Amino acid sequence: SGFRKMAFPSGKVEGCMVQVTCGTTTLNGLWLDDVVYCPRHVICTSEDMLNPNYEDLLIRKSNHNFLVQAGNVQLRVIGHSMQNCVLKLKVDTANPKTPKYKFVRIQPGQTFSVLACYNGSPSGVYQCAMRPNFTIKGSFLNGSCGSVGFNIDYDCVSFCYMHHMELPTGVHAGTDLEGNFYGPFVDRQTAQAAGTDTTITVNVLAWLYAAVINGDRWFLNRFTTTLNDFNLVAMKYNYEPLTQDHVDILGPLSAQTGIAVLDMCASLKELLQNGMNGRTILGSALLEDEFTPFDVVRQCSGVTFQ
Amino acid sequence: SGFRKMAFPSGKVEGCMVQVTCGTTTLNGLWLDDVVYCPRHVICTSEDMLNPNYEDLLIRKSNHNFLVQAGNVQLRVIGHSMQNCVLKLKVDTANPKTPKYKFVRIQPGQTFSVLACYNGSPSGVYQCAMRPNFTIKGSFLNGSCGSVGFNIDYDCVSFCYMHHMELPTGVHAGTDLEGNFYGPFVDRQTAQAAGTDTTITVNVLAWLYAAVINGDRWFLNRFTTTLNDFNLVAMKYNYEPLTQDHVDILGPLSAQTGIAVLDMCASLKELLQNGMNGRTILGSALLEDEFTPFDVVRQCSGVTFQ
Numbered sequence: 023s024g025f026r027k028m029a030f031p032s033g034k035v036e037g038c039m040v041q042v043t044c045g046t047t048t049l050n051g052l053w054l055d056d057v058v059y060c061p062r063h064v065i066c067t068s069e070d071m072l073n074p075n076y077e078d079l080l081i082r083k084s085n086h087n088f089l090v091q092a093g094n095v096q097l098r099v100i101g102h103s104m105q106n107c108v109l110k111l112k113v114d115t116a117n118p119k120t121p122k123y124k125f126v127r128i129q130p131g132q133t134f135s136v137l138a139c140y141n142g143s144p145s146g147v148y149q150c151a152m153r154p155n156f157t158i159k160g161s162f163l164n165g166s167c168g169s170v171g172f173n174i175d176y177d178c179v180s181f182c183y184m185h186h187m188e189l190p191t192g193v194h195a196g197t198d199l200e201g202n203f204y205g206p207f208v209d210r211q212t213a214q215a216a217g218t219d220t221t222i223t224v225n226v227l228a229w230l231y232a233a234v235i236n237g238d239r240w241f242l243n244r245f246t247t248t249l250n251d252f253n254l255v256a257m258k259y260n261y262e263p264l265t266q267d268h269v270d271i272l273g274p275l276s277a278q279t280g281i282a283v284l285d286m287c288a289s290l291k292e293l294l295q296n297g298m299n300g301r302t303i304l305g306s307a308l309l310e311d312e313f314t315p316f317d318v319v320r321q322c323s324g325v326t327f328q
Numbered sequence: 329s330g331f332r333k334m335a336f337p338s339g340k341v342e343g344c345m346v347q348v349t350c351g352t353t354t355l356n357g358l359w360l361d362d363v364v365y366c367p368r369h370v371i372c373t374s375e376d377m378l379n380p381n382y383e384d385l386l387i388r389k390s391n392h393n394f395l396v397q398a399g400n401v402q403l404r405v406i407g408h409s410m411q412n413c414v415l416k417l418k419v420d421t422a423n424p425k426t427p428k429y430k431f432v433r434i435q436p437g438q439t440f441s442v443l444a445c446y447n448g449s450p451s452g453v454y455q456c457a458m459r460p461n462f463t464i465k466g467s468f469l470n471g472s473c474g475s476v477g478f479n480i481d482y483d484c485v486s487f488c489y490m491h492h493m494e495l496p497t498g499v500h501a502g503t504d505l506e507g508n509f510y511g512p513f514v515d516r517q518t519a520q521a522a523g524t525d526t527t528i529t530v531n532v533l534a535w536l537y538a539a540v541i542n543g544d545r546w547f548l549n550r551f552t553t554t555l556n557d558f559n560l561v562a563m564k565y566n567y568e569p570l571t572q573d574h575v576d577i578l579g580p581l582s583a584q585t586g587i588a589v590l591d592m593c594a595s596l597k598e599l600l601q602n603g604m605n606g607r608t609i610l611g612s613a614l615l616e617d618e619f620t621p622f623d624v625v626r627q628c629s630g631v632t633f634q
């Protein structure tokens with residue numbers, strides 16, 4: 023037992039991280055087969071980043087303007103192209119550590135692991151959720167651009183996130199690996215800001231089931247509620263609506279604990295209206311919304327990856 | 329910015345995990361050079377685990393009684409020996425993925441990353457602290473024995489923990505990699521229990537500095553306190569004493585924030601006596617004690633590992 027904010031093993035992604043340098047700008051790239059992926063604003067200088075025309079900026083570049091370092095070994099760039107907000111650097115060497123992979127775009131509410139890196143060198147790994155406002159509450163310093171987010175399914179890495187920027191509230195914005203931003207953000211220096219967020223209701227319910235599996239039961243109660251009447255309370259507390267599909271997804275967890283989904287909704291309702299009254303759930307004094315039903319089943323049942 | 333519970337990249341340890349089987353017992357082993365390390369109770373059956381004589385049990389075993397699986401490849405055991413509570417299985421093949429490593433024993437209060445595994449297959453990675461009572465609040469299911477904890481310093485893996493067992497409160501006990509238990513626990517099935525814990529004061533202070541670095545300042549105040557007078561309050565709230573050495577270790581963080589250590593102690597005093605009053609610090613409604621001063625400096629400054 024126990025319940026932790028658990029990341030996927032990072033090895034398969036570590037073998038893909040490289041350093042990309044263009045001018046005085048250095049950031050991280052992702053090396054898969056003979057292509058290196060990185061944020062396109064690598065080609066921008068300080069004054070370029072104000073209001074850039076990336077097509078003009080890139081045509082002015084040569085292959086030799088891009089230095090790629092894989093460890094202490096240099097990769098020769100033989101081609102380059104722009105795909106939306108990412109660069110694709112064609113290198114003469116295919117990465118022998120290329121795992122089986124996919125490029126997938128995730129939904130707000132879904133989680134992933136982030137391998138934070140600097141200068142192509144992995145620093146740490148942690149678990150994040152895509153917020154409803156399409157930001158992530160990451161941990162990123164200067165130089166972390168090009169760090170990627172991902173999930174692993176058996177042996178296949180599904181890349182879902184490339185880090186680009188920090189917004190003024192200290193949260194982070196980026197793209198999928200096709201270079202399409204998550205949310206209404208651009209790779210220019212404007213006054214863009216996050217905009218209002220909500221709590222991921224289905225994930226909170228998943229975590230309450232995690233707690234019951236792990237022995238926390240004080241918040242349970244005999245009452246029940248209708249889906250409609252729960253959603254009336256959810257809206258009042260800035261929680262997003264619960265759907266019949268969310269109820270279905272919570273089915274296995276319900277059946278394992280013997281607590282009907284709508285019964286857990288009644289408990290969440292009471293926790294929202296009364297607070298937690300000095301008690302804790304899975305070591306938290308707040309309702310936690312960054313574990314999915316998938317995450318709870320994986321951790322409380324024990325699936326591995328090879 | 330941002331602040332996450334960050335683990336070390338796990339790749340270097342993933343390449344060392346193997347499956348060890350003896351009879352019907354299967355658990356994880358750590359393969360370094362030509363030795364596989366694993367919990368000695370791998371040789372125990374259900375009835376053996378009651379009150380075992382491990383020396384008697386082991387002399388009854390042959391090399392061929394130990395099946396080691398490194399992926400889909402079998403390692404031939406050519407020797408075996410007991411070192412305290414771990415087994416050392418001599419195999420005919422040295423692990424070509426052996427990183428530079430050390431076997432280190434950590435102190436309560438120190439943190440480490442755990443690579444949870446099942447059947448020699450890594451499942452997830454997360455960050456833990458050695459509690460003052462020598463347990464860890466892990467996340468472990470049946471089959472996780474032999475999973476290891478570790479830190480990484482540039483390129484060298486310092487192994488500090490091998491998982492052995494779960495205690496009745498759902499916390500976890502294990503050994504260092506020389507097989508010496510952390511705390512007063514044994515690898516037999518007795519009524520052993522955790523025993524009373526405390527909060528890691530210096531770590532809470534480190535995290536308050538993390539918060540100030542990251543823009544949370546509401547808990548600051550003009551007052552100060554003496555080290556003695558703070559420790560009088562710490563004892564009352566089950567916090568462990570703060571030493572002059574802890575104050576020294578907090579020096580860099582103090583100097584970076586401009587907040588004297590004893591001034592932060594005054595703030596912690598007020599937070600202990602008044603609570604948090606519906607506010608949060610770094611996304612937490614509790615005082616968090618599982619980041620060290622080292623951890624805060626690493627994450628808020630940005631050190632990598634190669």
Ligand SMILES: *CCC(=O)N(c1cncc(Cl)c1)c1cccc(-c2cccc(Cl)c2)c1
Binds near residue numbers: 063166185
């Ligand atoms: C781009 C690399 C990077 O990691 N940057 C960064 C990311 N997270 C946190 C911090 Cl503190 C910095 C970064 C550095 C400078 C400027 C930007 C930027 C500005 C405007 C638009 C974009 Cl897409 C990026 C990012």
Ligand SMILES: *CCC(=O)N(c1cncc(Cl)c1)c1cccc(-c2cccc(Cl)c2)c1
Binds near residue numbers: 468470514515
């Ligand atoms: C030993 C492998 C293992 O992982 N075990 C376990 C660990 N963490 C959590 C759980 Cl739920 C199980 C384990 C399984 C059965 C018995 C023990 C045990 C009992 C008494 C002494 C010891 Cl050293 C181990 C451990």
